[PDB]
UniProtKB/Swiss-Prot annotation:
The phosphorylated form (by SRPK2) is a component of the U4/U6-U5 tri-snRNP complex composed of the U4, U6 and U5 snRNAs and at least PRPF3, PRPF4, PRPF6, PRPF8, PRPF31, SNRNP200, TXNL4A, WDR57, SNRNP40, DDX23, CD2BP2, PPIH, SNU13, EFTUD2, SART1 and USP39. Identified in the spliceosome C complex. Interacts with ERBB4. Interacts with ERCC6. Disulfide bonds: none annotated. It comes from Homo sapiens (Human). The chain holds residues 411 to 513 of 820 of the full protein. Belongs to the DEAD box helicase family. DDX23/PRP28 subfamily. This is Probable ATP-dependent RNA helicase DDX23.
RNA sequence: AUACUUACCUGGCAGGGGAGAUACCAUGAUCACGAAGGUGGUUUUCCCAGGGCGAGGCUUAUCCAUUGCACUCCGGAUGUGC
C-alpha cells in the first residue's frame, strides 16, 4: 500500500482517537484498511500482560458484511495484514462447510 | 409453484451377489500342428437373496341343499386371516 487512499487519510486518525465513524464511500476505495489499521495499532500495542487471556473469549473485533462475496474479499485482505502481525482471523459465512467452520 | 443469482447454515468414502467348474464359442495368441491359462460368453454345481405363478390344504360365519343305515375324508356358494 504505497499511499493512503482518501478514506484512509481521514478515517485512520479518527479511529486512532477511538471515535465512531460513518464512512461514505464505495467498495474499492480502501475502506477495509481504513478500519483495519486502527484496530491493528490497538491490538499489537496492548501490554503482553494484558494480551494475556487463558480462556478463549471470542474476538476483539467483528466485521459484518452483507454478502459472502464481500466478506471473503475482506477476509483475504484481513489475513494479509494480520498474519505478519500474528493476528488470527476467522470467517463465519455461508458457502462453507459447517464442519470446517465449526472447527 | 419453477428457473437462476447472492448471502447464511450444512457436508465423510465405497458398492452394487458370492465361490467352484466348464469338454464348447470368441479373444482368429509371433517360430515350423497346438500353450496352459487369463479375460468375455455358454452351460452347470454349490452359498444362496429377493420377486412371479398359486395346484392343494387350515380356520369361521351367511345363504342353499339334505330326514339320510353307516363303519375308507369328503354337498354347493360367498367372504376376513393363513
Amino acid at each position: 500500500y504505497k499511499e493512503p487512499t482518501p478514506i484512509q487519510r481521514q478515517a485512520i486518525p479518527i479511529g486512532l482517537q477511538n471515535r465512531d465513524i460513518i464512512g461514505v464511500a464505495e467498495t474499492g476505495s480502501g475502506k477495509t484498511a481504513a478500519f483495519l489499521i486502527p484496530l491493528l495499532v490497538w491490538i499489537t500495542t496492548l501490554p503482553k500482560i494484558d494480551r494475556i487471556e487463558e480462556s478463549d473469549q471470542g474476538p476483539y473485533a467483528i466485521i459484518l458484511a452483507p454478502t459472502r462475496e464481500l466478506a471473503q474479499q475482506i477476509e483475504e485482505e484481513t489475513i494479509k495484514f494480520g498474519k505478519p502481525l500474528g493476528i488470527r482471523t476467522v470467517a463465519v459465512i455461508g458457502g462453507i462447510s459447517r464442519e470446517d467452520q465449526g472447527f
